[PDB]
Design a protein around this ligand. Structure first.
Ligand code: MG
Ligand code: MG
Ligand code: NI
Lengths: 299, 292, 292, 295, 292, 292
């Protein structure tokens, strides 16, 4: 805590060098969500960490999400959500509420928390300066022709305009909402979006906070927790996983394969989780790396 | 305009030169509000105008407000107004709704409308990168010691960071919300705020859209609106009209005095009002200039 | 007349946005010539139109020529032309006079007018910093190739250094005279030369002023509104156009086919013809576009 | 021309170092005129020298004049003068001929000569981008007020825009013709103009070619044909000089006092005169240093 | 060591934020010497720390010294020192050996150690590009003693050229040797020199490694040594000290008074001493401030 | 001589224009060594020449060597050398002395000599900022297997970082010593190294000072003295050349066959040899150009 010998405090910082050296001047996309937003002590720690990275010469890019906040508003307002299946179905009136909450509330919280350390955080959506557009998406059953609503995926990204912000020393706080070729705003999956922007900016790393200690090869058995998994194998386990990890996983795959050296799935329930995963050799969380070939499977 | 002789169209476009020359490379703060937001045809025209200025080498900076939208939400949601003689009393919870509507809704509308022409508009508040801080304010009720709530005025502004945006070719869409010293976000008067940022950025002009045709030396007599007035002369007729034109006018004062060559109070009920006031000698409103 | 209602002016200006967005930040080569040089109003207008584009964020590159001025100056000097197959031959003594009238007279004219609006206009020839060279020109009189003096065509262009000028906010006024591969100055044909530099700079539009009112398929005026034709239908129309406008057309054809988006053959006899052509579509001649 | 032992050539070159070092990266205004323009071998040598300076990291700015060429043209056109004091009044038309000759002919010659070595020379007047404006001038004939036409002096200069050209590696060839505050272009004295732009650009030196070997207090043989001089010492010799050397001297005055470390009045009749005056200690010309030395 | 739990490890890091923020983008001059150079584990740790600072956005500037190495060489070479009462006289031959050892040996060691982490370290002296000149120094013994030889103090510094190196991401390793006004190379006191360059570059901090745990108020009192002092108090305890701390002391003075917010005198015998003094609230060493 | 007439002097300076024009803004690698370092008048002239090139807009890059100085030190320090086929076998203890002398002494001399004209010269090795790495090379004694110690060739070069120095107006003085893949510094052949950096920087020329007047093709016959040999033609002489020209010549091949338009082998015993070879059409020294 504080009664720790100085000679040991230095032995901690000193060990981070190999990491500070690997991240310096590099972009790092962090997907904020889960207990990280909920718990006060956790988020306050998250904001402090972003400042840490910023004051080390690292370029953090935060991508956050909503859901509970969005549902809370839709209820508090009284919108009777329609369910064209097993999904919420994002209708126009709903999009307005989603965007309102995500950008005007959730993101605001984060920005102010970060800026408690300096003029760093700046909130933006795909709408602002058209940082990134979206393409309408839909779900299955089997005709797959089910229109879920104004939901979509990140289509294109203006990495140029984005890398300009990190250059000015700002920490962009992204709210997954982007217009399509026609101009209508669409709500995008925070996880997938984070992966998209990660690849586009040529990020050195992609972090994703979750209320889980890692990835499970077969959920029930917690002995199936992998601290590191190679791309080829993950792509083969995808069609046999939990739906809640599919976005997290696909995001990592799209990222690590799109060029992002590695993607991490850490436990956001831990205080200063980002500092631990970046400057400590703790085998906590799941690390994804590009790896194809029978040998990556055989070993 | 098709049956309008070509020799006239030319004169209209030509007569713009003297103005395009005066505004080129200069910053122009425009305060959006009133029918401008309400009417669809008007706002769509407003967005097109901002693109016009942008594609002419001019640097527009939009500052918008709420109020009706904010009240609509506070009601539609359920939040009961716990008032004070004509003031809404922005409680910590009210601020949350205000900021939510202004930034996450009102501003969004504007940004998307502008960006229908290109990657121009970008929404920001005083919160983002601490573009500008605020100082808690209080209005006149009984002796004036009334803390209406989380309301304030623009204290400091990071003109540097702002001039950086206009440099990148972006059109900033500001939502009057800035953190005080301690760091708590407040709600600022769009009109006054627009005036603050105008002066800070060394803007060539400050435009303010209103549902009124001008300034009134004699109200309601109609042939007594000044086409152009000047500082000092305004301060004399300052205490004559009502409270709705006080901030507007007071804003233009703080503006011209703070360095802004001139402030304009045009009628936002007119389609393409900004184009008329900037490239047509026909003053759509009243121009305020530094007078001796 | 000023009776034009304030809402009609707004419509005019507003209707120019789609074009400002298209030309902004781009290069536009204008071939100044014809009565546009002669008439005291038209010419004074052209200078304003260039200043206009310059203050809109556009990049204008004027390319002019002499002709009537040259012959005129030769008459005063008493230099009798040495014709050969209808071609006056450019003897050294003549080249000297062209460089004088073209670069020291007609060019200074434009530069000074344009510069009444600001430090924009700057006159140059291929000789200056070797911005562009010229290749000998050979023409047949009767049976075969013959030398017609010191006449040439635009060959190499330092588009890199050329684009630097417009980037510096300067309006390059070009006098079609370029050095031979061995440094022998030549007189180039403004028309063909304009189309040449237009292509070398990779410019959006090519504006060509002419003392002729229209492109003609015959003149049962109703079928003269070729407001916009395309690059192939004009090719087949080339063996049936007026004798005074074939070069204006061949120039446009070259430019567009080469890589220039659009070519406009407007009637410079119209005050503010440039403006009318760029922000309106109201009949100023033809717009040649990529077609086939 | 050969037979010169290499060990000596090296000595010659090595001696330019102190000078190359003093001029490197600095601006040097050179006033072209006289036999320099007339003689073919001389001008061809002048152009080569400008290229020399350019390829050494020096920033040469050439200012030329006319007169004989201008008069030659006016005669072919029969524009006979309206002299009113030993000089021609610059009627609006005469200006047109002057500008035509200076910019469209005299300057052209120079530019092409220089560019025979590379994309260096670029011709400009005060008209282009308003590099420098002019103020109407009027020389006292019997009283004081006597307009002599569209003649003037360099008023303001856009040193910024000018220093931009030398930055791009260009050698500006200026033709003394500038616009008036009310947009009226006049004809300016090459000598005085050269001095004006020299001071404005903060030039390290100002050279002026003449058909004279130096300055003379009086007009006979040995002694008063000086080599070094300064302010005050010249100001007193001003009213004692024929008009054939008044603007020349004043040019050096307005320049040195203006800031230019030194102004030189060399003999342009010598081949490669500029190379001799800049990289050879034998200064066969009249230099003009700061007025507080030998005061 | 490694058994330390995660959270306790993260906390150590987190507690560094207030410091990384204060040093980011700032220059930090570190005077290397003593056991720091001697002990292998210590220097290897020193080099790692410089890389730490470098990879955090901090700009470290290392200034080292010799003495033992210099004396070692002078002995191997068999150069009997011509002493002057407390001082060896730096004859022209001695300077050559000094410079040879300091730049070609001592500094080399450091550079290679640093660059074991990346293309960071770059060795230079006042000689290179004339980064800084020196003025002959005379240390009078009793009343007077004149020149001890080619010894001097840092006169002028080219902070511009220096700040250029830190800009390129390089970590300059300075060897205290500068040119005379006439170009005569001199040997400068590492401590004083470090202070000179510190002030010149507008360094946020000046660190000085020593084989002592702090600054002594009453030398070998132990127990109550100074934890923090300032310009006035530190300058008043000057005439009551041993020579083995005068330069280390004057340095901190010339620095802090010069503009350096604070100078530190830490114990270089501790592994990673620089990391402890910069990112740990350990009250070791001694902090010298200006005051007010 | 002052006795020489001025009309001649000019002719000399003038005749250099074609050369100044060819070298302006270009890099020129000069290998310093031999009498050039020994003789005082010669080196003082060498330093003046580098300043000449620098003050002409040329970018000189000096690469020097040792050997005699290195051997001189090894002897004074009494370090017995282990030989192999006639090689010193650079052990870790010898390398330290080599680097010490080359960088901390030989190079220092040169730098200070150059900077006697201005803040130009800056000494660096492959160690600094890792400007260039080295690869262990072994010699051949009719059985290549001869690890003659820490000797190697220039492997990679950071032309970027190097071209940055010449950009700042500095004259880099290189001491052939570079890190190994693992950081083990090695001593590199000045001649070959100079050739390596020459090619890497895209140098316009490579000069090499020697105590020989030319390139005597095949053993003593003052008649067989080339003046301008070429690749291939020269290549077929290496196996039949003295050992004192093998590294020089083998270095001139990698230079021109590597990109460098031409390499020159001049006589460094001549005062101002560099000025003669670069601005005098003297046929002294041997030139090497490309030739399939
Ligand atoms: Mg595996
Ligand atoms: Mg049309
Ligand atoms: Ni197996």
């Amino acid at each position: 805590i504080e009664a720790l010998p100085t000679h040991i405090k230095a032995q901690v910082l000193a060990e981070a060098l190999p990491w500070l050296k690997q991240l310096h001047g590099k972009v790092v996309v962090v997907k904020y969500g889960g207990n990280a937003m909920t718990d006060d002590t956790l988020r306050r720690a998250f904001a402090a960490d972003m400042a840490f990275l910023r004051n080390c010469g690292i370029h953090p890019v935060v991508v956050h999400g909503g859901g509970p906040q969005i549902t809370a508003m839709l209820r508090r307002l009284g919108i009777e959500g329609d369910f064209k299946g097993g999904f919420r179905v994002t209708t126009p009136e709903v999009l307005d509420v989603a965007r309102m909450v995500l950008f005007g509330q959730v993101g605001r919280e984060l920005v102010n928390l970060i800026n408690a350390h300096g003029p760093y955080a700046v909130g933006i959506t795909g709408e602002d300066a058209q940082l990134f557009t979206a393409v309408r998406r839909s779900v299955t059953v089997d005709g797959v022709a089910t229109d879920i609503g104004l939901v979509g995926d990140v289509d294109q990204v203006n990495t140029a305009a984005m890398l300009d912000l990190v250059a000015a020393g700002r920490i962009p706080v992204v709210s997954t909402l982007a217009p399509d070729a026609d101009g209508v705003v669409h709500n995008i999956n925070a996880d997938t979006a984070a992966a998209a922007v990660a690849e586009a900016l040529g990020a050195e790393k992609l972090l994703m906070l979750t209320d889980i200690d890692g990835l499970y090869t077969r959920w029930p058995d917690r002995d199936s927790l992998v601290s590191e998994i190679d791309t080829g194998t993950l792509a083969q386990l995808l069609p046999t996983l939990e739906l809640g990890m599919v976005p997290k996983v696909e995001a990592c795959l799209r990222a690590v394969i799109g060029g992002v050296p590695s993607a991490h799935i850490i436990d956001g329930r831990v205080t200063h989780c980002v500092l631990v995963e970046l400057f400590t050799d703790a085998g906590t969380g799941t690390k994804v790396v590009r790896g194809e070939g029978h040998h990556h499977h055989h070993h």
